[PDB]
Amino acid sequence: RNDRTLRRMRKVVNIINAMEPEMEKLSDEELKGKTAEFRARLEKGEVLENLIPEAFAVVREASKRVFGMRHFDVQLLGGMVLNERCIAEMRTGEGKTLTATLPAYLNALTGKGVHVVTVNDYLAQRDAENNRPLFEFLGLTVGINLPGMPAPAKREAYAADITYGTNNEYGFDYLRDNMAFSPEERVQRKLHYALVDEVDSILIDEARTPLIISGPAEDSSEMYKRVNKIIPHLIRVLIEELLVKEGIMDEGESLYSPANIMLMHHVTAALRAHQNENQTLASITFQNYFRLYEKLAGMTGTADTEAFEFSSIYKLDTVVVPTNRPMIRKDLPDLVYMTEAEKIQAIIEDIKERTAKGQPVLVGTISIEKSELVSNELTKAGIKHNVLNAKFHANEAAIVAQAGYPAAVTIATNMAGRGTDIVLGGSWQAEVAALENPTAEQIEKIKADWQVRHDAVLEAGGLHIIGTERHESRRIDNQLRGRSGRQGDAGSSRFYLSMEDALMRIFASDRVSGMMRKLGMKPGEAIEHPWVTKAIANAQRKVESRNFDIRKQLLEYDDVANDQRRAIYSQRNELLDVSDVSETINSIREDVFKATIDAYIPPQSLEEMWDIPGLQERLKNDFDLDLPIAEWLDKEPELHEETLRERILAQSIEVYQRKEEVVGAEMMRHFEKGVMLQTLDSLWKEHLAAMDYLRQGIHLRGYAQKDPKQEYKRESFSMFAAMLESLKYEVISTLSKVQVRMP
Amino acid sequence: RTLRRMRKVVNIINAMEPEMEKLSDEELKGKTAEFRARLEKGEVLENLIPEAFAVVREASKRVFGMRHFDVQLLGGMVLNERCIAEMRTGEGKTLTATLPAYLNALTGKGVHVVTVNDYLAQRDAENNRPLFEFLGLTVGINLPGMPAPAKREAYAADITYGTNNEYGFDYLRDNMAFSPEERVQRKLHYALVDEVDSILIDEARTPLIISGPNQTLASITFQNYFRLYEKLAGMTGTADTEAFEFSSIYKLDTVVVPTNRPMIRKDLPDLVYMTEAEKIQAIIEDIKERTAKGQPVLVGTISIEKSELVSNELTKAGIKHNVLNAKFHANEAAIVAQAGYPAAVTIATNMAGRGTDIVLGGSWQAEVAALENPTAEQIEKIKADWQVRHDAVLEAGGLHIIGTERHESRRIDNQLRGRSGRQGDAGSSRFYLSMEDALMRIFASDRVSGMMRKLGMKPGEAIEHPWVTKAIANAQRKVESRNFDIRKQLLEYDDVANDQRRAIYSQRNELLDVSDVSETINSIREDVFKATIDAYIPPQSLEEMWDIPGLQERLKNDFDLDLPIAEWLDKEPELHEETLRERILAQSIEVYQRKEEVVGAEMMRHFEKGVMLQTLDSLWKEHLAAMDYLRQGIHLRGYAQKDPKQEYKRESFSMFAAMLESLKYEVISTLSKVQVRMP
Ligand SMILES: Nc1ncnc2c1ncn2[C@@H]1O[C@H](COP(=O)(O)OP(=O)(O)OP(=O)(O)O)[C@@H](O)[C@H]1O
Ligand SMILES: Nc1ncnc2c1ncn2[C@@H]1O[C@H](COP(=O)(O)OP(=O)(O)OP(=O)(O)O)[C@@H](O)[C@H]1O
């Protein structure tokens, strides 16, 4: 799979490289000209993928000229990966941010937009501004989208060829677009391509995080009095006592009905209770926001392990991109000791032995106390070193700078991801950055000195990483080890574990674990077994896998809400996009008036079988339509069920035409549209609140036994279909009963 | 006087520099032997300050490429006294400190430079080692985990460097030693404390404990650790707020050191608004005007959420800026580097103390930093273009600081503020408050506070009422002083235990320092026998009141001393009380003489010492536990119009007095009951 894709891509790389001379000979204007020229071709029905070699060749040359930098072949590969529904895994230091100029350019050609998704505003802003002169060189515009930005500025940012901004704010824009009353209010365009800069946090860790817009844009207060008023007779089964009372729920209904849920919430708040609240107007999770893009792609580092998750949550394939130089870091067999003490003793040994050959070491621990421990023992053994202490960030940046210096030893606690590159030999710019007026032959010096240090650290084996314990998450171990062997540099790594260590628990048999014990790891000595390393890694994988199972069940609950939100927003946007909702109105009125009479007159039925005590009233009650109708048919005996069905619809229409000559065609059309949006909104927010309740009234509504979800999907899909019909009927009522000072 | 008098000295040192420039390095190394010899012959240390400091300045010029500035000589002088030097950020505290360290190393008693953490202790011992080696002095470094022989060595160096924690710990472990040769520290001579706010104030009352199996075996607070030194001094920022505290906790004076260049930062009057919304609009508008003229702005807020709000509103206003987000370290350092760049706008949440310098115009050093292969005139173009930006930000007013809210502690406000106007640069600051602000609540009255709403403030009609700046500053001053009034009560209690530990460690040390404890043993044997006997034979009473049965058993049970006292008495109608007490002593001794003929004398001497120490350490451990219990019962034991304390002091005193008698007892019961096989 990865092997043959990569082969096929290496072939296209060789095409691109051969085009380099053509792009070189080209003037700056001629280069800017390729864009319109690709677009002309696309307009004539070219396939965008056929453009990859020339477009990449064009972007590569532009970047030589604007940035002074020329995409490496691995970067060309990474770019082609990101044209597909894929994650490019590119090792820290491989140049993700330059890589990303390639797919961003290519996927801008069709004029549909590109969303570059950064983790924070600083990078959005930084990247937009760094790339603006590149992409302007190429006749594209760039937009920057930020929180607080006004809507007209936002509209421009989204109308640029390429956009930068954080995941959050993309989401938030989406929601507010789905709260618009006119389509000119939208800031976004159709969601074309999302290129996510760091997928681990953005797509995975934060997959289920809801984006919520709330607004004290509540409404009602009556209920909390009504429902309170019942409570000063509640005196320490208990469903029935509650049920049978008032002018809400009269008709022998059920309160524990997933339907009366807001009510039940009212009573159970009123009982718990012994200015306006701001409800959710709109929600989406990130995972479901990303799933809306026609095309999705992104980048992460080589630390992987979550390929199975990207695939199942997002259908993102993943391509492991080679590094530009050979990755020669030596990841040695995990070692396993009886006790911590024995473990540390052999850790200190390793460090002793290495720092004496001039090799620098970075010790990653799982806690401060674990740090202080390995530290103090290093001091006991006479080994100089420094701890990165999270309280002294300044000291930490200075430590980190000399951390590749010969025989340097640095201890870090639960170390993060990416982090500052550690330069072997020490950093030599960090050194002239300290020189308040330098020279050519001071510089010469610093650098000569440094090459000698650097070549000696490489020759001593590069940065050695020591993991004093492993994490449950291998991704994290992998990020630790990944700080060594960057850009082809020698380095190595080794993890230590002991039988005393926390992680021993991940095997889930305590005695099955205590069998390595029976290889009693003798004091002086040591062996290495390749199967242990794979056991451990396998176990880390199984914990990850079971965690993701747990999470798949959560995402299934989520798919219920996604499916309902997609459908309803789809309906809302059909309406929004139409200036004239009138024929939709005509059809719903018919739907509503057929069903409404059906529930009183049975189709193709006998006058013997028709009723008014509730009908007659229902029509006056919900429609301000008063047809004292009994007599129509005892005074005009012949017409018939179908010529009358017709006739009531006709009336209703006549009262409506009447109100409209009074108000204005347009004014009316626009009101109806407004009513249909406002009512869909109301219902939907009601619906969301009710689902949230069920969903929590269902971590425990009942039983280890039967199926909680399932029943929940059914209840919830069911209320969504009820809401769909209640929307038709509530819109028609409104239009029927609307007051206007007449003739 | 002290400043104007110190300036005279500085004039002397300045006038000696031609002299010193004429000296070779070896001549300069030589002055240290010369100073010491003068000292041997009776010279007062303070008489050397001119020569010593001028030598240290020349040594620094040659070794560091740095010449101490005049204000730095002043600081170093201050630090020779029992005194806190206040020096503003950027003034070169670290170089300044080399002066008194040098001076106070000269008598050969040692110097402890106290650092907040192990990185700085090593960093500065190594940075300074060649300066001090240039001058014939050695440097020691003390770390946690360091073997005793290496610590012993660090403490034998002329000047030592380490954290407060490790210094204090060493002291307690030294006071758990069973031979004096085990001690790591020398007499506590001079402590130079680097960040006295954290080290001496915030942490004054924090106990350093050693436990074992779990229970406290040794304890001392930081205050009382530093109070052991003969000379104490320290450094902090002029961000003041705690001088009265230093005097009370430590008997340190404080001296504000003048900046090398004049301070010209314009700290404008504080501004009050009705609402948070009105506050932001005034902030936005300040930024707007200031950035349109090229001036950079740093904005400090009191939460993430308030940073956001101020951020979104700037954006809403079309003002580009960057938030410092604690989640993104690398971004933050990148942002900081250029936060002095024209019209830059930067927002920081609960800005934390000193922080990184903001170079006006931008940092150009982080420009050369960014190069792959920087080349001389790649630089000059960088430095020259920078000089233009720097001077344009200076002309524009330097860095403007905006507080969007004040913290209840003014030290925090002052640290935000102090980020501007460093080393003579132009700068300004403004703090914003609203009636909706949490701080309004420090006034402790709704209505008093709420009166100021009557100013009716009104947008683009803000006035400026100076009285309000000072009313605020006084409020923050009252809160501190309140909190310290309480703390002073808590230290009145700490002092009880302090004195008790002084007393008991003194004693213990006296024992430790000697190899023969015989005078004391013989002498406490008498005490113990008297008291034990007194319990059964009330002095000067008739025979009828004596419990000779009770005394017989007691001697057997606690002294393995089995005497037929009833037979003596009965057989010598002769023998009376005094004479009887003497027999009992004599016997105990003869029994002891005999074990000593077996065991050997020097073995016995050392047995007796070890027993005294160990018995002391057990009773003390017990005593600390019970002093703890007694103190936390402090509420309802002392009740209605006595002082609790007075009472606590009384109970404490009694309990300590009883322990010393009870120490005597157990030592002699042990020495009495020790089994030895008679051959
Ligand atoms: N083709 C290239 N030629 C020259 N310099 C490059 C090239 N590609 C990248 N660089 C430089 O290499 C560095 C590597 O890191 P970069 O900011 O791209 O992130 P990375 O480590 O791959 O991942 P991330 O960017 O997400 O932190 C950058 O300094 C970049 O300017
Ligand atoms: N006399 C001098 N000549 C040249 N440079 C000096 C001189 N004195 C101090 N410096 C430099 O001034 C800078 C600020 O000093 P230092 O690190 O002592 O900062 P500080 O804020 O005063 O001390 P601290 O960080 O301990 O609070 C340092 O980079 C230091 O080397």
From Swiss-Prot, chain B:
SMART domains, per the entry: SecA_DEAD, SecA_PP_bind
GO terms classed as biological process: chaperone-mediated protein folding; intracellular protein transmembrane transport; protein import; protein secretion; protein targeting; protein targeting to membrane; protein transport; protein transport by the Sec complex
Catalytic activity: ATP + H2O + cellular proteinSide 1 = ADP + phosphate + cellular proteinSide 2
Keywords: ATP-binding, Cell inner membrane, Cell membrane, Cytoplasm, Membrane, Metal-binding, Nucleotide-binding, Protein transport, Translocase, Translocation, Transport, Zinc
A single Gene Ontology CC term: cell envelope Sec protein transport complex
Induction info: Repressed under conditions of excess protein secretion capacity and derepressed when protein secretion becomes limiting. This is regulated by SecM.
Pfam families: P-loop_SecA, SEC-C, SecA_DEAD, SecA_PP_bind, SecA_SW
First-level EC class: translocase
Cofactor: Zn(2+)
Membership in a protein family: Belongs to the SecA family.
Function statement: Required for protein export, interacts with the SecYEG preprotein conducting channel. SecA has a central role in coupling the hydrolysis of ATP to the transfer of proteins into and across the cell membrane, serving both as a receptor for the preprotein-SecB complex and as an ATP-driven molecular motor driving the stepwise translocation of polypeptide chains across the membrane.
Protein name per the record: Protein translocase subunit SecA
Protein species of origin: Escherichia coli (strain K12)
Upper taxonomic lineage: Bacteria, Pseudomonadati, Pseudomonadota, Gammaproteobacteria, Enterobacterales
